Design a protein around this ligand. Structure first.
Ligand SMILES: [Mg+2]
Ligand SMILES: [Mg+2]
Lengths: 92, 92
């Protein structure tokens, strides 16, 4: 399968981001062979956030072959995130 | 449930967009009470495409409460699109 990288755009002053980040790390750990998770502090790298259209946090962007294939805005429960990622994890 | 609007950013010179557009219209028809689909020709409205970070077509952007909540890049089979939308259609 093509490698997948989930980028977690967050800010230190964001409450919901606090919820999501450990869920994402658990996910990466649980699907280590197929999924890499990287956190990007939007206040540390605003140009990067702008390059990928991040206008609020948390924003999760899934990359395949070095380009975004999906972007989800806002925090969501573990179950919801698992299900969004599953088709990509089970796909080519 | 909050109304949902799926925006289909396409271009007349895009092959895959030809596949996706009728699938999206079938979806809207099939979930008429909860989902509205709008097509935006990126060559007709480049400012709009840029506002929502559209860099390739087709790009599908789901709006809830007037703001994007999810964005999927590229064409996908009917089954895959149905499943991406289902949680939002079944959610608040
Ligand atoms: Mg899992
Ligand atoms: Mg349907």
């Amino acid at each position: 399968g093509a490698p997948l990288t989930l980028v977690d755009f967050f800010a230190p002053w964001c409450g919901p981001c606090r919820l999501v980040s450990p869920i994402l790390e658990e996910l990466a750990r649980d699907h280590a062979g197929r999924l890499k998770v990287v956190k990007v502090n939007v206040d540390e790298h605003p140009g990067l956030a702008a390059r990928y259209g991040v206008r609020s946090v948390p924003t999760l962007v899934l990359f395949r072959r070095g380009a975004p294939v999906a972007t989800w805005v806002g925090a969501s429960p573990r179950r919801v995130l698992e299900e969004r990622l599953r088709p990509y994890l089970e796909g080519r």
